[PDB]
Structure formats: C-alpha cells, structure tokens
C-alpha cells in the first residue's frame, strides 16, 4: 500500500536525468560559443 | 486498487517532470 | 500528509520513467 | 486526497517526452546514415 519507495525511486531517476539534461545544455552552449571563436 | 503516496513526494516528482518538460525539447529539437 | 494513487497509474508512470532513463542518456552523450 | 488527475498529467507529459525522444533517436540514426551516403 505505501508506495513511497517506488515514488522516491522515480524522483532519484528523474532528478539524475535532469542533472544530465542541464549538463548537456551547458556543454551545447559552450560548444556553440567555441565555434564562434574558432571561426 | 489504490496505493498511498506522500503529497510532498508527489509535488517533488511533479517538479522533476516539469523541469524535463521545460528543458529537454530545446535540446532535442536543435 | 498522504494522497491516494491508482497502482496501475503508478506502474504506468514507472514505465514512462524507465523508458526516459533507458533511451535519453545515449542521445545526450552523443 | 485522490491525486489521479495529477499522476495522469505526469503520464501524459512523460509519454509526450518519450515520443519526442524516440523521434529524435530515429532522426539521429537517419542523419548518421545519410552522411555515410554523402561521404
Ligand atoms: Cl537534484
Ligand atoms: Cl504513448
């Protein structure tokens, strides 16, 4: 009946994905920035 | 069949879902 | 404070979360 | 107390994102395939 452990598992999974999304976002902003410097 | 969930945890899960919804599309669409 | 959730809906939400976990990293990591 | 509408909202949001992820995946596999043909 208490599904806390399942929901907390989903929070951990989604928060890990969100951390990865923001790191990818910052890496893409950085990559675009470096190409303007190269070109 | 129903299960019990902490309101604060469902609010947190909602926050995580809304964050993927807000930032993932711009990356995937270029 | 607790709220009630349908077990089938939590199972479906789990399926959706596991699918983003399985396919999103390969795209984001190149 | 009944949080069905919230959870179903999350299912719809995540399933939309999953549809977008698989479409992006197929578009990336297609893009890589076309570059081998061009080169
Ligand atoms: Cl976090
Ligand atoms: Cl679907």
Of how many residues is chain B composed? 30
**Element of type H or E holding A4:** helix A4-38
Adjacent-strand bridge partners of C4: B4, D2
Between the alpha carbon of residue A20 and those of residues A31, B10, C10, C20, the distances in Å are 16, 22, 24, 12
Nearest Cα residue in chain C from A21: C28
Sketch the domain layout of chain A as residue ranges. 1-39
Distance CA A36, CA C5 (A): 50
Structure tokens that stand for B8 in this block = 């604060």
Q: Method used for this model? A: X-ray
Contact A7, B12 (CB under 8 A): no
**Element of type H or E holding A12:** helix A4-38
Structure tokens that stand for A11 in this block = 């929070």
Among the bound ligands, name the one nearest to the CA of residue A23: 1
How many angstroms is it from A8 CA to the middle of ligand 1? Answer: 12
Helices (H), chain C: 7-28
Contact residues for A8 (Cβ-Cβ < 8 A; gap 6+): B9
Residues of A in contact with B10 (CB under 8 A): 7
Q: What's this structure's resolution in Å?
A: 1.9
């Amino acid at each position: 009946e208490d599904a806390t452990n399942v929901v907390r598992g989903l929070i951990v999974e989604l928060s890990n994905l969100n951390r990865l999304i923001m790191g990818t976002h910052r890496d893409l902003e950085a990559f675009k920035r470096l190409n303007y410097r190269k070109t | 069949e129903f299960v019990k969930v902490r309101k604060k945890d469902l609010e947190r899960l909602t926050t995580e879902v809304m964050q993927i919804r807000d930032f993932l599309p711009r990356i995937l669409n270029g």
